[PDB]
Each structure stands twice: as structure tokens, then as C-alpha cells.
Design a protein around this ligand. Structure first.
Ligand SMILES: *[C@@H]1O[C@H](CO)[C@@H](O[C@@H]2O[C@H](CO)[C@@H](O)[C@H](O)[C@H]2NC(C)=O)[C@H](O)[C@H]1NC(C)=O
Ligand SMILES: OC[C@@H]1[C@@H](O)[C@H](O)C[S@@+]1C[C@@H](O)[C@@H](O)[C@H](O)[C@H](O)[C@@H](O)CO
Ligand SMILES: *[C@@H]1O[C@H](CO)[C@@H](O)[C@H](O)[C@H]1NC(C)=O
Ligand SMILES: *[C@@H]1O[C@H](CO)[C@@H](O)[C@H](O)[C@H]1NC(C)=O
Length: 864
């Protein structure tokens, strides 16, 4: 009835009463824009047949199809509901064809459940039988979280749909898209999901990855929940103002998880506990990365490397794009334009830097007796290509080198082939990390060099609103064949399988190291293997603004090392845009300036040795590097516990509804507030100051604002950076590389809260060994301040850095003058009495001539 609650029965064409009648739906052409004229009745779909059956894990139910017209075809007579109370905070239910096995995602991390129902549930499940619906409610307040009763269950071979009411309009997630805002537009929006090489622009299309997870903040108490659909077929998600969300997919099964938490962070941690927590990055990967498509020659690349080094830019990583290769073919380098490549790699390494190489999936099939191409010959020997529908002939498409075949990374034999290719190539060019691109998989022809046969896979009864309207557009035929199944079912898993296989190759090429993998295409869980960048953006102010929601969303998806191409991939970048983008970009979890072919240089040093852009870039990159121990400890918590790294204001300040749609500012973890200027010509920014004590990072002075909108003054050389009272931030004196910075003196910034208290922590390991956390080879220490006292305590202590690191400076914000400062080491008074400098105007104390060894317990005490 209520028009906001109508579930659209004609998603496929403009609505007509004739089609409405044919489908047995309800007709009412009255309503506002976007309200469906034709909608499902209150008894379309399925009913429960007989009784539910208790099982050890939860229960099952048989659903029987309520007689109806077959809109998009073969509609399943008998559906089985299997429900599992997997944990106190996670519910799993799956709807399958009772009579036939159907494709299920072969996820690498998620395991089948074998236990008994969890005790102490935070939720209750309710089942209605006529018609079928399922509801998940929060036990403590009976808030209805998931409720499918707004709409039917639809379950045909190539058309599956289920809807849920939502308890609020605070909805975040879904991908990969450019949403433009972070809090969802619930006003009749459809988001298609199907991995596609397309521009992240203002048109709201399907982009490179597939992420079905969303989080909902139920109210200001912080209680939140999330939902994940384990399905890799083309789909779309429909948001409406009831509020409700509908999932509509074209194959597979409806395999759902519902997660509850007391805060938005706890929901993310529950999601990541299920699909896999992100890999811990190499510490060097947290530094600044520089890149462009078509330096053209090694000489031109060297020029760029050298002018940025000459400028003393913090600068850890150089990427090499397809111009390094011999005619854009993997596992080669151009012996003329890139003559001396191995010597250049030595220079990079000698200067404490890292090389990341681009590698594409598609392999040139141009190889002869006369002119052999090794990777193709060896791949063909092992028979690891994606085949055409005939099941035996490798599919031919077209990418950078010309005609190509495509590896089937779902075949574990393919990982063996891939690893060997990397071993051979690493012997020639000693790269340190790998950038996997075009892995949607991207094809320059639609389907294959012979197009695609018309059939129900290439041309399904219902096509979600993907870019160009055909599944095989700029990708492979839907009836192509791989180890895990047909492309129709596993298309969205290509980039995921490739990331898995590339991590496997790293085990051999980089024994016991993390290395670094940057991936374009992703599926749920890709973060366990890889970082992500947000794709081929454009040098516009809109693109700068749109990057923040994309970063925040990928942190929800457990891919916290994420960022756009700073300054913009496509087009020449205006100096002002690039300056603002470098200021902000210094605080993306993944910080990379990358540029498209032919455009004017946009590396920082290219703007002039004395320029405002270079000076500002260097300044804020130096702050980023100073705070790297804090950022690294955030990545430790994402890896070990599932926390976000780049974090929405509302995850910390959910009590305050002014934060619920803030997406022009974000946090690093709980304590650092980042406020960019995001408008052309502006020297200020309208910003929200949450309900906490804040201190300006640069001056240390407490801001006079709290829980209110403000116009923050930020001239051309500034970005807003504020530290939260109650938090202690570990720092380390910066250098132009992390190789070197990791050997420098440490520091602490203690930002006092109103009670003159604060707490913080520091994770420290070797920065590069894989699984130091799982194998327990690390240091974790805690800092806590009360009146008159700092305690440094050690909770895990199985790694001691051989560089004799020590805290040599402590800066205290929001303090009255400390006097008689005293340092004790395990109770014993130690090392003279430190030097204390005090600014009574700003209420800042700095303690120096101190040496608190990393890994040792101390008490530091003072009077007022
Ligand atoms: C793609 O086609 C090839 C043949 O071109 C298939 O290769 C088979 O691989 C298996 C196991 O590795 C061998 O035992 C067979 O002898 C191979 N067949 C032939 C004709 O050589 C390959 O299995 C196909 N891939 C997929 C996913 O179907
Ligand atoms: O390795 C070279 C480039 C690397 O620098 C980028 O980071 C990724 S890739 C450029 C590629 O994404 C782009 O050519 C699209 O395929 C088309 O625009 C397509 O979308 C048109 O249909
Ligand atoms: C933009 O999206 C709309 C659907 O919302 C579509 O009809 C149109 O073709 C798209 N165009 C491009 C170039 O993305
Ligand atoms: C910074 O790095 C260089 C090596 O590039 C090293 O020679 C120097 O001593 C380091 N300095 C610091 C910040 O102490």
C-alpha cells in the first residue's frame, strides 16, 4: 500500500498495465517520481510447507512456490531455507533449490559451518509461513533489523530477488561505485554490480569490483548491523525510502549473512571475521608511491626519480607501467627504451626505494619457432587458459599487446605457471611488489575476437542496468569456461582469483615476506591479499571530492590500503587542484600520484624546485611519515581485529547526528581528524568539529570549537589536521624513505582530554615478515596518562628491534606547566631529570633529553 513500500514488479521496461496484468502485479499509476506504477501484491512468492526442522546449527524450512506467472523464466518449485546461528553476533541463512545443486561462490576464506547454534545470541530470528518471510531482530530492544516481508522471494534460474526493510536511513557501503556521498541516497536508486573496466565518473555505473556489504547505524546509541550477500553473478541493489533495500541477481543462490554490533566498528569487525581480515602491509608500502603511464623511456623515468629525490620528497616507491615492457607484453622489458633497467633497479634499491611493476593478466598469443614468447608457450604447455564454450579451445580476445589468451587463475595449476613466470622475470628485473591491472577481466573486444553466441548466458532474460547493457561488453563471453565454472557465474571472481594466485607466487619470489600487491578488480575478501586503487579518475575538483567516500567504503570492505590517483589520472592537472590533492593525498591510506599517457607531468618536483606545491607536498608528506608508527599500528588493528584505518567521523561520534552524513572529512583511526579544502579557489572550509577536545597538529593549540560546524581557515599551503583529546600518538622522526626512517628516534604526542588523561598504543615488528602477528613475533606497548603520570607498559614482547630505538621527546597538549619531571625504569629512578620546555600561552609542554627504550616499561611523573 504505502507508496514508499512498493516493490517494483517491472524493473525491466517502462510500466504498462498490460504487462502488470500479465505478471499478476498491482497497478497504480498514482505516485511521485520514481514510485513504481506496477508492484508486487501481498501474496506473490513462496509459502512454508509444513513444519520447520531443528538442526544442530539452527533450522531448515521447505518453501513451496505460490502459483504465479514466470516473468523471467524457470521459477523454482521447491526452495530450501537453511539457517545457522553461527555466532552470538552473526546469523547465516541460505535459500537453495531443494531438487538441484546450483552455483555457490567457492570463497577461499569462508568455511562451511559444522558447529552447534551459538549461545547468548544478540539476535532473534522469526519466520512467517504465509507468505514466506524472514525477520532478524535485535534481542535487547526488539529492533527489527532484517525483514523480508516488504516484498516477495523470487527464485528463478536466472532471476533471484529478496528485499529487506531497514531501521534507519543511515546506510553505508556497496561497490564498486562512485556514490558521490557516503551516506546512501535512499530516494529510489539502483546500483548495478558487475566487474567492469569503466571510468569512475558521475554516471553511477558498475566499476571494477563487486562488494555486496552494507552497514546500517540504527540510532545514536551506536547499535548497528550489516548484511552481506555471498553471490558473484551480475546483480543490482535497489534502495528506496521505506527505507528498504532489494538485492536482484541473475544466478547462483541467495546466501546471506547478518552481523550485529554495539558500534559501527564492531559491525565491520564481525564482517571481516567472516570474509577475512586484511593483510598487514609491508611498512614501506605506507610510504609515498610515484607513477605514470608512459614515461616512454628509462631515461625519462630516471629524470623524474632524480628530481623528486633532489627535492628531498618523502618517496619510497616507484611504479613502472606497461611502457617498461617489450611491446606491452608481460615478463619482458624493452631492451632499447629500457636498456639498463637492471642497473636502475640497483640504484633504486641503493637509495632505499622499492620498485613495483605492473603485470596484466592477458598473454599475447603471438609466438613462433623463429620468435618464441616464453609465457605463452609455457602457459599453453600447461593448458591453463580460459577456454571458449566448447570447453577445449583457449578463448582469444585483445588487450595491450594485440590478440591475447587469458589465464584461468581458478586452476591451481595456473598458480604454478604464474609463479614460474615471476621467478624467471625476477631474475632479470628485481622488482619488490606487483601491480595487477585490467583484471575485471578487461577485453578490448566484446566477448572474444568472434563476438559471443546468442544464448541465455550471453543474453539473459533479465540484464541488470550495467554499463552498455550487455554482460560481455569489454570482457569475456559469458559461456567461456574455467576451473571454478562458466564466466556467467565467476566473472566477478577473476580479479579475486588473480590476487590469490599472485600472493601464492610471492611465497616463492619473496620467501617469508609480505611484498606488496595492488589490484584493480576485487570481490569480498580481496583485502586478505591486496591493496586497491580507485581506478582511472580525472583531474577535476569533483573527482577530488568523490575520492573520500570511495576510500571510506573500501575500509568497510576490509581493503584499508586504498586511494585514488592523486592529482588525477586523465587530463593535465591544474596547479591548484594538484596542490590540494597532494595535501589530502598525504593522508590516504594508499598514497600514490599516478598520471595517464601524454598529459603534462604531475610529479611534485615537476612544479618547480621552489614551488608552493612542492613545499606543501613535502611538508605534509613529512607529517605523514612522522605519524607512520601510528598509521602502522592502525593497520595492525585492521589485520588482527578488523578495525577500519581511514574511518568515518560517525564511527567515533555516532552519538551526534551531525556526523551521520559527513564525507568531506575523515579520521585516521580514533584520534586524527583530517579536513581538506575541496573547492576551487577556496582558502577556507566549512567543517564539522565533533564533541571532543581538539588540538591543532601543527601549533598544538586547543581549538575553541566543539560539537559544531565551523568555517576553518586553510590558506593555499594548509590542510586541517587535529588531534583528539584523550589519545596518545606514537611518532618517529621522518626521513625520505621508511628504510631510513625506521632507524630514527621515536616520540609521543599526548593530547589530554578534559580530565587530563589520555591512552594510546604502539605495535612494532620487523616491518616486512609475513605473519609476524599469527606467529607472535612483535612488540605491543600501551601508554596511559593520568594526572601527574605517564605509564609505558608492555603487553607482548617477542620482537626487539636491533636499532636500539627509544622515545626521545614527549609533547603534551592541553597541560598546565609540568615541573620536577622524573623518569623511572621498572621503579628505579633513571637518567638525570629530563629537559622541559613550556609554552604557557598554548598550554604545550615538550620533554626532551629523555631516552625511553622501546620495549621497556617506564613511569614518567611530574608536579604542577
Ligand atoms: C581448456 O582446454 C584444455 C585443452 O585445450 C583442457 O586441457 C586439459 O587439461 C587436463 C588436466 O590438466 C588434461 O588432463 C587434458 O588432457 C587436457 N585436455 C586436452 C585436450 O589437452 C582444459 O582442461 C580446459 N580448461 C577448462 C577450464 O575447461
Ligand atoms: O597500464 C596502462 C594503464 C594504467 O596506467 C592505468 O592505471 C590502468 S590502464 C588504462 C585503462 O584502464 C584504460 O585504457 C581503459 O581500459 C579504457 O579507458 C577503457 O575503459 C575504455 O573502454
Ligand atoms: C549513464 O547511466 C545511464 C543509466 O542510469 C545510462 O542509460 C547511460 O547510458 C550511461 N552513460 C554512460 C556513458 O555511462
Ligand atoms: C636519512 O637518510 C639517509 C639515507 O638516505 C641517511 O644517510 C641519514 O643519516 C638519515 N637521517 C636521519 C633522518 O637521521
Amino acid at each position: 500500500v504505502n507508496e514508499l513500500e512498493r516493490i517494483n514488479c517491472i524493473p525491466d521496461q517502462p510500466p504498462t498495465k498490460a504487462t502488470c496484468d500479465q505478471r499478476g502485479c498491482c497497478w497504480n499509476p498514482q505516485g511521485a517520481v520514481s514510485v513504481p506504477w506496477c508492484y508486487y501484491s501481498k501474496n506473490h512468492s513462496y509459502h512454508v510447507e509444513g513444519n520447520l526442522v531443528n538442526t544442530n546449527a539452527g533450522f531448515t524450512a521447505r518453501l513451496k512456490n505460490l502459483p504465479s506467472s514466470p516473468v523471467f523464466g524457470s521459477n523454482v518449485d521447491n526452495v530450501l531455507l537453511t539457517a545457522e546461528y553461527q555466532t552470538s553476533n552473526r546469523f547465516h541463512f541460505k535459500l537453495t533449490d531443494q531438487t538441484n545443486n546450483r552455483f555457490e561462490v567457492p570463497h577461499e576464506h569462508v568455511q562451511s559451518f559444522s558447529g552447534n547454534a551459538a549461545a547468548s545470541l544478540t539476535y532473534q530470528v522469526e519466520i512467517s509461513r504465509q507468505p514466506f518471510s524472514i525477520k532478524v531482530t535485535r534481542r535487547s530492544n526488539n529492533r527489527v533489523l532484517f525483514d523480508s516481508s516488504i516484498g516477495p522471494l523470487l527464485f528463478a534460474d536466472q532471476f533471484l530477488q529478496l528485499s529487506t526493510r531497514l531501521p534507519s536511513t543511515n546506510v553505508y557501503g556497496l561497490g564498486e561505485h562512485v556514490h558521490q556521498q557516503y551516506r546512501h541516497d535512499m530516494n529510489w536508486k539502483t546500483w548495478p554490480i558487475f566487474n567492469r573496466d569503466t571510468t569512475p565518473n558521475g554516471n553511477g555505473t558498475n566499476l571494477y569490483g563487486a562488494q555486496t556489504f552494507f552497514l546500517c547505524l540504527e540510532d545514536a546509541s551506536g547499535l548497528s548491523f550489516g548484511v552481506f550477500l555471498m553471490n558473484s553473478n551480475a546483480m543490482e541493489v535497489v534502495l528506496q525510502p521505506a527505507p528498504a533495500i532489494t538485492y536482484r541477481t541473475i544466478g547462483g543462490i541467495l546466501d546471506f549473512y547478518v552481523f550485529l554490533g554495539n558500534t559501527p566498528e564492531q559491525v565491520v569487525q564481525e564482517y571481516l571475521e567472516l570474509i577475512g581480515r586484511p593483510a598487514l602491509p609491508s611498512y614501506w608500502a605506507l610510504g609515498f608511491h610515484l607513477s605514470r603511464y608512459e614515461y616512454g623511456t628509462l631515461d625519462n623515468m630516471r629524470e623524474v626519480v632524480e628530481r623528486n629525490r633532489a627535492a628531498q620528497l618523502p618517496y619510497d616507491v616507484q611504479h613502472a607501467d606497461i611502457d617498461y615492457m617489450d611491446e606491452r607484453r608481460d615478463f619482458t622489458y624493452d631492451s632499447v627504451d629500457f636498456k639498463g633497467f637492471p642497473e636502475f633497479v640497483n640504484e633504486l634499491h641503493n637509495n632505499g626505494q622499492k620498485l613495483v611493476i605492473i603485470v596484466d593478466p592477458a598473454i599475447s598469443n603471438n609466438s613462433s619457432s623463429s620468435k618464441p614468447y616464453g609465457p605463452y608457450d609455457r602457459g599453453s604447455d600447461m593448458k591453463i587458459w580460459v577456454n571458449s564454450s566448447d570447453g577445449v579451445t583457449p578463448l582469444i580476445g585483445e588487450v595491450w599487446p594485440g590478440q591475447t589468451v587469458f589465464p584461468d587463475y581458478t586452476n591451481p595449476n595456473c598458480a604454478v605457471w604464474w609463479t614460474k613466470e615471476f621467478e624467471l622475470f625476477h631474475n632479470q628485473v628485481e622488482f619488490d611488489g606487483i601491480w595487477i591491472d585490467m583484471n575485471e577481466v578487461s577485453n578490448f573486444v566484446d566477448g572474444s575476437v568472434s563476438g559471443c553466441s546468442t544464448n541465455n548466458l550471453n543474453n539473459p532474460p533479465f540484464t541488470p542496468r550495467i554499463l552498455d547493457g550487455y554482460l560481455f561488453c569489454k570482457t569475456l563471453c559469458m559461456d567461456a569456461v574455467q576451473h571454478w565454472g562458466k564466466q556467467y557465474d565467476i566473472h566477478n571472481l577473476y580479479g579475486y582469483s588473480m590476487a590469490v594466485a599472485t600472493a601464492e607466487a610471492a611465497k616463492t619470489v619473496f620467501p617469508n615476506k609480505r611484498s606488496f600487491i595492488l589490484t584493480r578488480s576485487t570481490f569480498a575478501g580481496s583485502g586478505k591479499f591486496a591493496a586497491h586503487w580507485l581506478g582511472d579518475n580525472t583531474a577535476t575538483w569533483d573527482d577530488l571530492r568523490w575520492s573520500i567516500p570511495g576510500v571510506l567504503e573500501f575500509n568497510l570492505f576490509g581493503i584499508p590500503m586504498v586511494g585514488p590517483d592523486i592529482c588525477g589520472f586523465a587530463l593535465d592537472t591544474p596547479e591548484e587542484l594538484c596542490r590540494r590533492w597532494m595535501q589530502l593525498g598525504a593522508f590516504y591510506p594508499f598514497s600514490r600520484n599516478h598520471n595517464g599517457q601524454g598529459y603534462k607531468d604531475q610529479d611534485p618536483a615537476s612544479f618547480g624546485a621552489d614551488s608552493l606545491l612542492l613545499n606543501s607536498s613535502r611538508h605534509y608528506l613529512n607529517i605523514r611519515y612522522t605519524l607512520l608508527p601510528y598509521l602502522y599500528t592502525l593497520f595492525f588493528r585492521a589485520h588482527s581485529r578488523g578495525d577500519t584505518v581511514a574511518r568515518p567521523l560517525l564511527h567515533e561520534f555516532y552519538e551526534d547526528n551531525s556526523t551521520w552524513d559527513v564525507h568531506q572529512q575523515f579520521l585516521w583511526g580514533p584520534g586524527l581528524l583530517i579536513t581538506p579544502v575541496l573547492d576551487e579557489g577556496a582558502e577556507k572550509v566549512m567543517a564539522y568539529v565533533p564533541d571532543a577536545v581538539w588540538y591543532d597538529y601543527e601549533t598544538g593549540s586547543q581549538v575553541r570549537w566543539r560539537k559544531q560546524k565551523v568555517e576553518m581557515e586553510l590558506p593555499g599551503d594548509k590542510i586541517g589536521l587535529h588531534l583528539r583529546g584523550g589519545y596518545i600518538f606514537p611518532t618517529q622522526q621522518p626521513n625520505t624513505t621508511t628504510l631510513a626512517s625506521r632507524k630514527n628516534p621515536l616520540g609521543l604526542i599526548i593530547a589530554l582530554d578534559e580530565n587530563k588523561e589520555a591512552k594510546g598504543e604502539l605495535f612494532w615488528d620487523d616491518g616486512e615478515t609475513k605473519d609476524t602477528v599469527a606467529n607472535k613475533v612483535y612488540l605491543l606497548c600501551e601508554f596511559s596518562v593520568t594526572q601527574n603520570r605517564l605509564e609505558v607498559n608492555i603487553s607482548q614482547s617477542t620482537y626487539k628491534d636491533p636499532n636500539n630505538l627509544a622515545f626521545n621527546e614527549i609533547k603534551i597538549l592541553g597541560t598546565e606547566e609540568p615541573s620536577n619531571v622524573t623518569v623511572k625504569h621498572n621503579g628505579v629512578p633513571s637518567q638525570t631529570s629530563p629537559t622541559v620546555t613550556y609554552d604557557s600561552n598554548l598550554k604545550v609542554a615538550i620533554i626532551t633529553d629523555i631516552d625511553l627504550l622501546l620495549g621497556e616499561a617506564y613511569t614518567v611523573e611530574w608536579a604542577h
